[PDB]
Design a protein around this ligand. Structure first.
Ligand SMILES: [Cu+]
Length: 146
Protein backbone atom coordinates (compact mmCIF):
# COMPACT_ATOMS: atom_id res chain seq x y z
CA UNK A 1 0.00 0.00 0.00
CA UNK A 2 1.22 3.55 -0.76
CA UNK A 3 2.98 5.84 1.70
CA UNK A 4 1.40 9.01 3.04
CA UNK A 5 2.43 12.40 4.44
CA UNK A 6 0.91 15.29 6.35
CA UNK A 7 2.62 18.62 5.66
CA UNK A 8 2.16 21.31 8.34
CA UNK A 9 2.60 24.94 7.29
CA UNK A 10 3.17 28.15 9.24
CA UNK A 11 0.47 30.85 9.07
CA UNK A 12 -0.81 33.68 11.25
CA UNK A 13 -2.67 30.99 13.20
CA UNK A 14 0.37 28.82 14.08
CA UNK A 15 4.15 28.61 13.65
CA UNK A 16 4.07 24.79 13.69
CA UNK A 17 5.66 23.43 10.54
CA UNK A 18 7.15 20.18 9.28
CA UNK A 19 5.91 16.73 8.32
CA UNK A 20 4.54 13.45 9.57
CA UNK A 21 5.33 10.63 7.18
CA UNK A 22 3.79 7.14 7.06
CA UNK A 23 5.63 4.32 5.31
CA UNK A 24 4.77 0.62 5.23
CA UNK A 25 6.91 -1.61 7.48
CA UNK A 26 7.52 -5.35 7.33
CA UNK A 27 5.72 -6.90 10.34
CA UNK A 28 2.18 -5.63 9.73
CA UNK A 29 3.07 -2.13 10.93
CA UNK A 30 3.50 1.39 9.57
CA UNK A 31 6.64 3.42 10.20
CA UNK A 32 5.84 6.96 11.38
CA UNK A 33 8.41 9.78 11.11
CA UNK A 34 7.63 13.08 12.85
CA UNK A 35 9.71 16.17 12.14
CA UNK A 36 8.17 19.34 13.57
CA UNK A 37 9.33 22.75 14.73
CA UNK A 38 7.78 26.00 15.83
CA UNK A 39 5.77 24.45 18.62
CA UNK A 40 4.45 26.71 21.49
CA UNK A 41 6.16 24.56 24.14
CA UNK A 42 4.71 26.08 27.35
CA UNK A 43 1.15 25.15 26.31
CA UNK A 44 2.19 21.57 25.55
CA UNK A 45 2.70 18.66 25.76
CA UNK A 46 0.82 18.36 22.50
CA UNK A 47 -1.59 15.54 21.77
CA UNK A 48 -1.94 14.78 18.11
CA UNK A 49 -4.39 12.46 16.41
CA UNK A 50 -5.79 11.41 13.08
CA UNK A 51 -9.21 13.08 12.71
CA UNK A 52 -12.14 11.97 10.57
CA UNK A 53 -12.54 14.75 7.97
CA UNK A 54 -10.18 16.72 5.72
CA UNK A 55 -8.84 20.13 6.62
CA UNK A 56 -10.88 22.45 4.34
CA UNK A 57 -9.44 25.26 2.24
CA UNK A 58 -10.16 27.69 5.10
CA UNK A 59 -7.61 25.76 7.26
CA UNK A 60 -10.17 25.61 10.10
CA UNK A 61 -8.90 22.74 12.22
CA UNK A 62 -12.31 22.42 13.92
CA UNK A 63 -13.82 21.22 10.64
CA UNK A 64 -11.80 17.99 10.85
CA UNK A 65 -14.36 16.99 13.53
CA UNK A 66 -13.57 14.09 15.83
CA UNK A 67 -10.84 11.49 16.23
CA UNK A 68 -10.61 8.64 13.76
CA UNK A 69 -11.64 6.21 16.52
CA UNK A 70 -13.41 3.48 14.51
CA UNK A 71 -5.47 3.19 28.38
CA UNK A 72 -3.20 0.57 29.96
CA UNK A 73 -2.08 -1.04 26.69
CA UNK A 74 -1.56 0.45 23.21
CA UNK A 75 -4.39 -1.39 21.42
CA UNK A 76 -6.89 0.03 23.92
CA UNK A 77 -6.19 3.57 22.62
CA UNK A 78 -8.14 5.15 19.80
CA UNK A 79 -6.67 4.15 16.43
CA UNK A 80 -6.08 7.76 15.55
CA UNK A 81 -4.66 8.46 19.02
CA UNK A 82 -1.05 8.49 17.92
CA UNK A 83 -0.05 10.58 20.93
CA UNK A 84 -1.81 8.38 23.47
CA UNK A 85 0.08 5.35 22.22
CA UNK A 86 3.45 6.82 21.30
CA UNK A 87 3.85 10.01 23.33
CA UNK A 88 2.59 13.53 23.00
CA UNK A 89 4.68 15.85 20.90
CA UNK A 90 6.62 18.10 23.23
CA UNK A 91 9.16 20.89 23.10
CA UNK A 92 9.74 23.64 20.58
CA UNK A 93 11.09 21.04 18.12
CA UNK A 94 10.23 17.38 17.95
CA UNK A 95 11.70 14.60 15.81
CA UNK A 96 10.84 10.96 16.38
CA UNK A 97 10.27 7.63 14.67
CA UNK A 98 8.09 4.71 15.72
CA UNK A 99 5.96 1.84 14.40
CA UNK A 100 2.17 1.88 14.71
CA UNK A 101 0.32 -1.40 14.19
CA UNK A 102 -3.17 0.02 14.15
CA UNK A 103 -3.30 2.62 11.37
CA UNK A 104 -3.43 1.27 7.82
CA UNK A 105 -2.13 2.40 4.45
CA UNK A 106 -4.26 -0.14 2.61
CA UNK A 107 -7.01 1.63 0.68
CA UNK A 108 -9.21 -1.44 1.14
CA UNK A 109 -8.57 -1.55 4.89
CA UNK A 110 -11.02 -0.28 7.48
CA UNK A 111 -8.26 1.55 9.46
CA UNK A 112 -7.05 3.34 6.31
CA UNK A 113 -5.85 6.85 7.17
CA UNK A 114 -5.45 8.20 3.61
CA UNK A 115 -7.54 11.28 2.92
CA UNK A 116 -7.95 12.04 6.63
CA UNK A 117 -6.17 14.71 8.67
CA UNK A 118 -3.90 15.20 11.66
CA UNK A 119 -4.53 17.83 14.32
CA UNK A 120 -1.94 19.01 16.84
CA UNK A 121 -3.49 20.28 20.09
CA UNK A 122 -2.34 22.31 23.02
CA UNK A 123 -2.52 20.41 26.29
CA UNK A 124 -5.96 21.95 27.03
CA UNK A 125 -7.45 20.59 23.77
CA UNK A 126 -7.24 23.76 21.66
CA UNK A 127 -6.42 22.94 18.03
CA UNK A 128 -3.18 24.65 16.95
CA UNK A 129 -2.47 23.38 13.43
CA UNK A 130 -3.62 20.60 11.18
CA UNK A 131 -2.79 18.98 7.86
CA UNK A 132 -4.33 16.64 5.32
CA UNK A 133 -2.86 13.16 4.90
CA UNK A 134 -1.94 12.86 1.20
CA UNK A 135 0.21 10.62 -0.99
CA UNK A 136 3.94 10.86 -0.33
CA UNK A 137 4.91 9.83 -3.87
CA UNK A 138 3.60 11.15 -7.18
CA UNK A 139 4.21 8.09 -9.39
CA UNK A 140 2.53 4.72 -8.83
CA UNK A 141 1.97 1.42 -10.60
CA UNK A 142 4.17 -1.58 -11.33
CA UNK A 143 5.60 -0.07 -14.53
CA UNK A 144 6.31 3.41 -13.14
CA UNK A 145 9.13 5.28 -11.41
CA UNK A 146 9.07 8.36 -9.16
CU1 LIG B 1 -6.89 15.60 17.79
Amino acid sequence: SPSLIAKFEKTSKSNIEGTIKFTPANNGTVSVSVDLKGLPSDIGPFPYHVHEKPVPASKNCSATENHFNPAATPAAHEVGNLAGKHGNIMGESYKTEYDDSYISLNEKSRSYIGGLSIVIHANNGTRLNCANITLLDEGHGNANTT
